[PDB]
């Protein structure tokens, strides 16, 4: 439980999912991990993979970092999604919450605008 | 909505503490709200609202916003805090978590090093 230990992991679970690499997203999640968004809630680390893995509404994605915030426990990631051919999707402000050196939850956070 | 209420009411926290209307930011906050934020954890509404009126080191500042964040049931607010001469003293990432009607708990961020 570090500031420096949380910013590298939130930078390896955007890592797992850039990469397609869902043995490294396990890894960086607790088991009841949920993920949260306006229009979705995933409640479950392996619903969470399977989804990521299978269901996702665009493939070959990416995740820039513009900047990454540190809070007494949790990180705020201020980045954009980008489908295959550089095309914003959203921006986004994620927020990690983190159990026992893994993420327990994210919310992810879209422009009012 | 319940969304829309959410961020009016993260907008009035800001607009409380900068027009220094406590009574106005008492009417937001839980019971039991806390703050947070890397070396200081702030708990209580009526200790919160004392520290923001009598304990700031500077009370003459403002929070600009940027860019306002919507979540599934959390806010993130992008802003900048000004010093009364309107120079920055930081960048933030506000997260507001609500309960009940009011805030019940804001997690400051700064950006990384
Ligand atoms: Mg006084
Ligand atoms: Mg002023
Ligand atoms: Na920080």
Do not use: C, K, W
């Not at 420096?4 to 955007?14: C, G, K, N």
């Not at 392996?46 to 994605?61: C, G």
């Not at 990180?75 to 051919?85: I, K």
């Amino acid at each position: 439980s570090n500031a420096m230990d949380r910013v590298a992991t939130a930078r390896a679970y955007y890592r797992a999912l850039d990469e397609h690499d869902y043995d490294l997203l396990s890894d960086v999640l607790a088991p009841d991990f949920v993920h949260d968004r306006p229009d979705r809630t995933i409640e479950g680390r392996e619903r969470f993979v399977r989804f990521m893995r299978e269901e996702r509404p665009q493939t070959d994605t990416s995740h820039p970092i513009a900047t990454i915030y540190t809070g007494a426990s949790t990180v705020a990631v201020e980045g954009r999604l980008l489908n295959s051919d550089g095309a914003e999707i959203t921006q986004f402000v994620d927020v990690f919450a983190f159990e026992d050196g893994v993420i327990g939850r994210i919310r992810t956070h879209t422009p009012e605008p």
